Amino acid sequence: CRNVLLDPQLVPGGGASEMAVAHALTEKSKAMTGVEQWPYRAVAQALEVIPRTLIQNCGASTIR
C-alpha cells in the first residue's frame, strides 16, 4: 500500500525482474565498448544466477 501510494508505477515482475536487468546490461556492455565493458559484463552475469535457481526447483536443464 505504501509502494502503490508512493508510485502508482510498479513492475509486473516475478523473478522476471532480476532477469530483465541482467540481459539489459549485457546488451549495453557490447555497444559502449571502452575499458568499462569487462567489469560491467561481470556484474551482468551475477544478477542472472538468481532467477536461474528458481528454475532449479521446477526441473530440467536450467540454463536452456
Binding site: 526441473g59 530440467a60 536443464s61 536452456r64
Partner: protein, 64 residues
C-alpha cells in the same frame, strides 16, 4: 550391416525398443505367480538405463 542381411527385420532404436519392452513387463505377471514377480520388477527397470542416459549426456532430465 551383416546382421541386417541375417535378420529380415530392423527396428527403430535409440532406446525406443527398450521402453516398449519394459512397459509390457510392469503391467501383468508373465507367468502368474508371485515368485516370478519379484524378479520381474527388477528386469523391467534395468532396461530403462539405455534411453534415459542419452538424455542425461545431453542435459535433459531423465524422468521427463
Amino acid at each position: 550391416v551383416k546382421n541386417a542381411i541375417d535378420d529380415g527385420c530392423v527396428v527403430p532404436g535409440a532406446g525406443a525398443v527398450e521402453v516398449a519392452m519394459a512397459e509390457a513387463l510392469i503391467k501383468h505377471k508373465p507367468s502368474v505367480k508371485g515368485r516370478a514377480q519379484l524378479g520381474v520388477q527388477a528386469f523391467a527397470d534395468a532396461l530403462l538405463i539405455i534411453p534415459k542416459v542419452l538424455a542425461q549426456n545431453s542435459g535433459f532430465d531423465l524422468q521427463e
